[PDB]
Design a protein around this ligand. Structure first.
Ligand code: FES
Length: 136
């Protein structure tokens, strides 16, 4: 189950700058930002919050989705949890890929999503499949 699902129209996403889709039983959010498309698992790796309801902002020169529940910052391009480490000048830090990023292509003004296999495991996978509870 790893080839293109057409998730909709280029025109339909440019307006709102985000849309959700179900791709081979995996629910994803697609963001269109600064002329680029980014797809990831819809439920936040931290506790399962609705990333499609978060705000997009730049931190350390990287575009991030901010989960609306506990304001975790996830890079659009790599699914990295980002934070500043402060010693009571703040420095930006990562814990690697937390949020599974899928592949997006446009062709003929259609948005196509392909589920990713890389990396082998993401913290968001727990909230992406089967039996779970979500915590706010
Ligand atoms: S569930 Fe997203 S930051 Fe806690």
């Amino acid at each position: 189950k790893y080839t293109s699902v057409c998730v909709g129209r280029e025109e339909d996403i440019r307006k709102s700058e985000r849309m959700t889709a179900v791709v081979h039983d995996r629910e994803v959010v697609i963001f269109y930002h600064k002329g680029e498309y980014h797809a990831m698992d819809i439920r936040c790796y931290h506790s399962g919050g609705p990333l499609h309801l978060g705000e997009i902002e730049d931190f350390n020169g990287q575009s991030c989705i901010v989960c609306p529940w506990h304001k975790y910052k996830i890079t659009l391009a790599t699914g990295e949890g980002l934070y500043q480490s402060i010693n009571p000048k703040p420095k930006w830090c990562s814990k690697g890929v937390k949020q599974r990023i899928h592949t997006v292509k446009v062709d003929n003004g259609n948005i196509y999503v392909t589920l990713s296999k890389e990396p082998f495991k993401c913290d968001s996978d727990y909230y992406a499949t089967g039996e779970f509870k979500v915590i706010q």
